[PDB]
Assembly symmetry: D2
């Protein structure tokens, strides 16, 4: 039984629902799925000031634990065609995992929300830099087709990863 990390960042909750949909779908694929969220840079104070809606009970992920799983799904809010600062900051910390060859041949996939395509591509590229195998896409609040897409995607990744083990 393969283990999967559904790591995500959301600012307004949209991506979190996508992440949960992907995780639930991945469980249907027969994988031990873990839903974590990237740590918030900038202090706990003045963070929930103006705009905010981060979830509390989603556990925070560590840059080093990413080598423990067989498959990683990354979903992030994006602006102006690139990752949010929080997700970018987190992935740069996997420098010890990169040279070690830790994430080589591990299965990966990406979800994004709002420059959507450029953001999707930028994120996939960073995962490819760690030698990860990439599983492509589908083909206010998330629509029914988005949630189904994330769900299918999540199951498809779990289904592929198991086939590799």
């Amino acid at each position: 039984m393969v283990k999967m990390l559904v790591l995500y960042y959301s600012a307004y909750g949209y991506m979190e629902q996508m992440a949960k949909a992907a995780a639930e779908g991945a469980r249907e694929g027969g994988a031990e799925v873990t839903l974590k969220r990237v740590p918030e840079l900038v202090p706990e104070e003045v963070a929930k000031a103006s705009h905010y809606k981060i979830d509390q009970e989603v556990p925070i992920a560590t840059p080093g634990e990413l080598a423990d799983y067989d498959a990683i799904i990354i979903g992030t809010a994006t602006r102006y065609g690139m990752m949010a600062s929080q997700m970018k900051n987190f992935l740069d910390q996997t420098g010890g995992l990169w040279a070690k060859g830790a994430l080589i041949n591990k299965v990966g996939s990406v979800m994004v929300s709002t420059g959507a395509e450029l953001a999707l591509i930028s994120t996939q590229w960073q995962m490819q830099h760690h030698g990860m195998i990439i599983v492509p896409l589908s083909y206010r609040q998330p629509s029914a087709q988005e949630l189904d897409g994330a769900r299918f995607q999540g199951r498809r990744v779990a289904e592929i990863t198991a086939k590799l083990h």
Copy 2:
């Protein structure tokens, strides 16, 4: 035993050597490897005029046959950060393969030569549009490290594809 297509385009021979290195490596991975070249647009006349060095005995590929293989490796010469016109023209013809879902979940990989990164990304994206699983890179005449990279890449793809069957 999986079947692989090493499809390529080369203008000065560099990519052809890369293609042959990838094919040979893929055979070592235990796959029935076929080395084809995309058809040359513009007539046979005035084609070999100024600059030219296309290989004759490499068989020409058809847009429709791409669904016959389990894995496809694409290698192309690039200019100004994008595919050569010949490779772009060929892949657009796979419109019947796209909607049919023919190339979904088939394993793929890309090699490029000279805007290298943008070209590598543009090509991978088109393959992802057909729902192909992507296997990332290595990590005058081709250097020893390039040929070894293409070789390893070719074997790695064949090795992965077999694991999926």
Copy 3:
């Protein structure tokens, strides 16, 4: 009075209307505007077979004439996130214009139609490779907002180019 080239490629006419809207808008900016279309690769025969709707009276452009204008607007149909083969083939021919430094500091802009963003970016990059100054975007048949966007864009480019002379 600056001279502008509105060069385009269209397969179903959408981009041609965009091109005409950009040209008309550029005339309102006070520029001698020329509307040309990239030459069609593959023979005149079997070209208008299945799908076709290229315009006859739009004059065909030559790869070398691009250095005659002060501003160039490029508009192209795109598939799977990149240029159409016809536009890509044409721009690669500007190799004599590149090393000569012919297109350096000339004003340019891009329009695309259907991978839209990746295509827009890929095209702009090739123009930047010739050292062209880039003017960014707006911010069945073309909608009223698309035509107005192309129109404004066309005028804005003409308005900028004149300011540089």
Copy 4:
């Protein structure tokens, strides 16, 4: 006399030298040049711990002041093909400048250092989203050709910006 902001981020000093070279070159173009650095996220403590070499006397920039200048040059260190977290975090804060139309038609340019091309493109795109006119590139420690490139680029931007006023 136009005013220019040479805003930058550097982790090991390479980009700072590029920034200074661009600023000095821009002064030779006849512009009031201001050299600022993006604020460092994460507290002052444990920041200079392991690796560090940020410059003290370079003044820190504010997200809102970017509308005060006529030209903006952005130079940033990059990893895995995208901006550093610090530069990305800063530019997202220009949301009030975007909808206001503050940065429209202002001249801009980008420098990067180490995924170089993808990073250069990602950054330019964000500037284009604010409607900024883009001036393309050249065509341990920075080499003589890099410094000359940044210098020329800096002067070229100042030279162009003045022509627009």
